[PDB]
Design an enzyme around this catalytic site. Sequence first.
Site, short mmCIF file in Angstrom:
data_model
loop_
_atom_site.label_atom_id
_atom_site.label_comp_id
_atom_site.label_asym_id
_atom_site.label_seq_id
_atom_site.Cartn_x
_atom_site.Cartn_y
_atom_site.Cartn_z
CB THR A 68 -0.80 -0.02 1.29
OG1 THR A 68 -1.83 1.16 1.18
CG2 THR A 68 0.15 0.11 2.43
CG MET A 69 1.78 3.11 -3.36
SD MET A 69 3.42 3.37 -3.27
CE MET A 69 4.01 2.69 -4.76
CG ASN A 95 -1.81 5.45 -13.14
OD1 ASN A 95 -2.40 6.15 -13.67
ND2 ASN A 95 -2.65 4.34 -12.55
CB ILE A 97 -5.49 7.98 -6.95
CG1 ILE A 97 -6.39 6.90 -7.91
CG2 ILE A 97 -4.59 8.71 -7.73
CD1 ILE A 97 -7.61 7.92 -8.50
CB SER A 146 -7.94 14.64 -12.50
OG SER A 146 -9.19 14.96 -13.25
CE1 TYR A 159 -8.28 11.94 -7.99
CE2 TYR A 159 -9.47 13.51 -9.12
CZ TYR A 159 -8.64 12.63 -9.32
OH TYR A 159 -8.18 12.30 -10.53
CB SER A 162 -4.30 14.86 -3.89
OG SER A 162 -4.99 14.25 -4.73
CB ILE A 194 -10.37 7.45 -18.50
CG1 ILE A 194 -9.53 8.70 -18.47
CG2 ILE A 194 -9.87 6.58 -19.08
CD1 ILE A 194 -9.37 9.25 -19.88
CB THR A 196 -10.98 3.52 -15.46
OG1 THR A 196 -11.36 4.50 -14.70
CG2 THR A 196 -9.79 3.74 -16.43
N1 NDP Z 1 -10.34 7.19 -14.88
C1 NDP Z 1 -10.70 8.64 -14.86
O1 NDP Z 1 -11.68 8.81 -15.33
C2 NDP Z 1 -9.78 9.43 -14.66
C3 NDP Z 1 -8.69 9.04 -13.68
N2 NDP Z 1 -7.47 10.06 -13.56
C4 NDP Z 1 -6.33 9.61 -12.73
O2 NDP Z 1 -5.71 8.38 -13.49
C5 NDP Z 1 -5.09 7.66 -12.55
C6 NDP Z 1 -5.46 6.35 -12.72
O3 NDP Z 1 -6.95 6.06 -12.33
P1 NDP Z 1 -7.80 4.88 -12.57
O4 NDP Z 1 -7.04 3.79 -13.52
O5 NDP Z 1 -9.23 5.31 -13.39
O6 NDP Z 1 -8.12 4.35 -11.22
P2 NDP Z 1 -8.53 3.02 -10.67
O7 NDP Z 1 -9.32 3.10 -9.55
O8 NDP Z 1 -9.28 2.16 -11.74
O9 NDP Z 1 -6.95 2.60 -10.47
C7 NDP Z 1 -6.15 2.80 -9.21
C8 NDP Z 1 -5.06 2.21 -9.11
O10 NDP Z 1 -4.39 2.21 -7.66
C9 NDP Z 1 -4.51 1.22 -7.07
N3 NDP Z 1 -4.46 1.50 -5.68
C10 NDP Z 1 -5.72 2.00 -5.00
N4 NDP Z 1 -5.49 2.18 -3.68
C11 NDP Z 1 -4.06 2.06 -3.53
C12 NDP Z 1 -3.23 2.10 -2.31
N5 NDP Z 1 -3.74 2.52 -1.25
N6 NDP Z 1 -1.96 2.07 -2.47
C13 NDP Z 1 -1.53 1.37 -3.60
N7 NDP Z 1 -2.22 1.43 -4.84
C14 NDP Z 1 -3.44 1.58 -4.69
C15 NDP Z 1 -5.36 0.24 -7.24
O11 NDP Z 1 -5.09 -1.15 -7.11
P3 NDP Z 1 -5.50 -1.60 -5.61
O12 NDP Z 1 -6.86 -1.18 -5.44
O13 NDP Z 1 -5.78 -3.17 -6.26
O14 NDP Z 1 -4.45 -1.49 -4.67
C16 NDP Z 1 -5.48 0.49 -9.00
O15 NDP Z 1 -4.18 -0.70 -9.36
C17 NDP Z 1 -5.09 8.36 -11.31
O16 NDP Z 1 -3.92 8.83 -10.97
C18 NDP Z 1 -6.44 8.85 -11.34
O17 NDP Z 1 -6.49 10.30 -10.70
C19 NDP Z 1 -7.65 11.12 -13.87
C20 NDP Z 1 -8.70 11.59 -14.79
C21 NDP Z 1 -9.44 10.70 -15.01
C1 C0R Z 2 -11.67 10.73 -9.26
C2 C0R Z 2 -12.36 10.05 -10.53
C3 C0R Z 2 -11.58 10.05 -11.84
C4 C0R Z 2 -11.50 11.70 -12.52
O1 C0R Z 2 -10.80 12.47 -11.55
C5 C0R Z 2 -13.02 11.97 -12.42
C6 C0R Z 2 -13.90 11.85 -11.21
C7 C0R Z 2 -15.36 12.09 -11.52
C8 C0R Z 2 -15.64 13.63 -12.07
C9 C0R Z 2 -14.69 14.00 -13.20
C10 C0R Z 2 -15.20 14.64 -14.46
C11 C0R Z 2 -14.06 14.76 -15.53
O2 C0R Z 2 -14.39 14.83 -16.64
C12 C0R Z 2 -12.58 14.96 -15.20
C13 C0R Z 2 -12.29 13.81 -14.48
C14 C0R Z 2 -13.32 13.56 -13.13
C15 C0R Z 2 -12.55 14.57 -12.23
C16 C0R Z 2 -13.59 10.54 -10.75
C17 C0R Z 2 -14.67 10.07 -9.68
C18 C0R Z 2 -13.90 8.91 -9.11
C19 C0R Z 2 -12.42 8.57 -10.02
C20 C0R Z 2 -11.63 7.86 -9.04
O3 C0R Z 2 -11.27 8.00 -8.14
C21 C0R Z 2 -10.27 7.31 -10.37
O4 C0R Z 2 -10.82 6.91 -11.25
#
Ligand code: NDP
Ligand code: C0R
Lengths: 265, 265
Positions: A68-69, A95, A97, A146, A159, A162, A194, A196
Amino acid sequence: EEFRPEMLQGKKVIVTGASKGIGREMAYHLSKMGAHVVLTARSEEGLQKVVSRCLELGAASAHYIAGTMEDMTFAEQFIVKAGKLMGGLDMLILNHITQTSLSLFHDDIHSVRRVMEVNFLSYVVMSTAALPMLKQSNGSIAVISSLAGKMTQPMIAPYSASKFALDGFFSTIRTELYITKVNVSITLCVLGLIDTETAMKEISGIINAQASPKEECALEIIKGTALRKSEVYYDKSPLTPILLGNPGRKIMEFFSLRYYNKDMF
Amino acid sequence: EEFRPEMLQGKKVIVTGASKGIGREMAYHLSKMGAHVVLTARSEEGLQKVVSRCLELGAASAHYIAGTMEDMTFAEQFIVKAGKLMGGLDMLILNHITQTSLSLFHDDIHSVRRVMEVNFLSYVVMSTAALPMLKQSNGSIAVISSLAGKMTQPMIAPYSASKFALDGFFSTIRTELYITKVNVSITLCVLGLIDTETAMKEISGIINAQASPKEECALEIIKGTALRKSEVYYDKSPLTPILLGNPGRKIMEFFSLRYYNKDMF
Ligand SMILES: NC(=O)C1=CN([C@@H]2O[C@H](COP(=O)(O)OP(=O)(O)OC[C@H]3O[C@@H](n4cnc5c(N)ncnc54)[C@H](OP(=O)(O)O)[C@@H]3O)[C@@H](O)[C@H]2O)C=CC1
Ligand SMILES: C[C@]12C[C@H](O)[C@H]3[C@@H](CCC4=CC(=O)CC[C@@]43C)[C@@H]1CC[C@@H]2C(=O)CO
Ligand SMILES: NC(=O)C1=CN([C@@H]2O[C@H](COP(=O)(O)OP(=O)(O)OC[C@H]3O[C@@H](n4cnc5c(N)ncnc54)[C@H](OP(=O)(O)O)[C@@H]3O)[C@@H](O)[C@H]2O)C=CC1
Ligand SMILES: C[C@]12C[C@H](O)[C@H]3[C@@H](CCC4=CC(=O)CC[C@@]43C)[C@@H]1CC[C@@H]2C(=O)CO
């Protein structure tokens, strides 16, 4: 110049939050390009599924270290173990969070302190641990952010803090590296909504907006980092990088250097 | 709307980092305006000497509670004690910061954590503690930031980080408050170099920049919070607000709202 998947072949790369999100997709891409890659997350079982598909895809190497980070110790010690296994480091992709969910802030002070520890602190920790090797190879770091790290949106105050924190810290480190003539680049990746699983499930019923492909986003993060760009905007609209690119700040950041003692560099 | 010193007569105000610099200066200005005020810092002797001058200046009331803002518990408890002490709260001025020096970031991981705790964390703590009173008063909060909270310059990464953290958080709280019709305002004060002793001391031998007077700065912070402006820029250059103002962000933010499910607020 342009990007060529041959630019990452044989390059040692670290990827956090690689277990599932766009971080996982980033691994798969690094693999197909043929790069040494050590992943990390918390889910040991999950890192497994991906590490193996990496070898298949064509990864010159593929390892995983669970943890864990939220523990700065494991974070600093992760970059060291990882570096040892690859005998050097070329690319650090911060990457991961901690979990966050849409909600009007009320008083979750401890939930905040955690968001900062995991989304910001751990990054500054690993980035420090990795700098010495990164200097050796003239590598580069990719800190994922983000739109909410360049601007404000409701229901995600901690969020967002950070992610803003990230911009302010690394943007400084970036120029601080550049004035001291150290060829290690920092690439802040500004992402839009995204595909995801985490994002979609968390904005369900609260925000209805078009999302972009978890895989294409990942390729762009890699390409941009490889090309050593300061910032990479990936979003549905071609207006984002312009509306959020803040040219004024660039101008001021430039002028400010004018008052420093060059000797101090 | 035009300011007038009358807007602060009889107002109950809390001011952090009032022991010296801009903090002490805001105290003095609040006093001349006949306001009830409770100040904090760590130096008891320091708070004493200034809590006196305040009275002499014409303060409707003046008391102090010494302590470190590195203690999250003392922070929250400070607001309640300070609220009972004045029987309410009208304006919260978050100004205190932790000792900071100009040096290229190396590996001070514990210092970073300290800066985030005191410069950012304690702020969300006191703003959360004080909100209920601020809601009754239909009052306001003033978060003192720096240019380095909107832009970036070498040798102040952790500081710059916490400042960016503030903008990300309170900008989100601010819009969250408006979206849920709560008449409590948030004023982010973007300050340029100011002639306090710790600032001149710290930039000595490193930075040339001209500073601006602490009293004029302090006054303008108050004027802006009173007039309930979102942000206030105080700098020697008239260009700063148009350069750091970042209008494209304001544009994005606005449209961003139009994607939420209006029944969440
Ligand atoms: N998806 C989106 O819409 C957007 C995402 N982002 C950014 O992109 C990045 C990836 O997001 P996304 O892929 O969607 O998120 P996910 O939640 O799908 O991926 C998060 C990753 O972090 C790991 N993680 C979670 N908690 C911890 C922890 N405590 N210690 C170590 N690892 C951890 C998770 O693994 P595990 O829980 O198994 O430990 C998973 O592998 C982030 O930095 C986020 O802010 C930015 C804009 C949009
Ligand atoms: C913060 C998250 C990713 C990303 O940041 C999202 C946010 C929801 C609102 C939002 C709208 C956008 O168009 C920019 C990305 C963003 C601001 C998302 C909610 C949970 C998600 C996660 O926690 C990681 O995927
Ligand atoms: N001066 C400038 O050039 C500029 C300043 N700023 C901002 O202005 C604000 C004021 O700065 P400035 O007046 O110059 O700073 P000072 O160093 O002069 O004042 C800092 C105040 O914070 C208190 N403080 C310090 N450490 C702690 C702690 N651990 N816990 C609680 N209180 C503490 C100090 O008192 P004590 O140590 O006795 O507790 C003091 O009264 C800050 O928010 C700063 O970032 C922004 C731009 C420019
Ligand atoms: C951060 C400080 C105040 C302010 O923030 C300063 C920074 C030095 C660099 C700098 C130059 C500017 O033109 C904007 C203000 C600023 C970015 C200062 C160094 C120490 C000082 C203190 O610790 C508090 O006053």
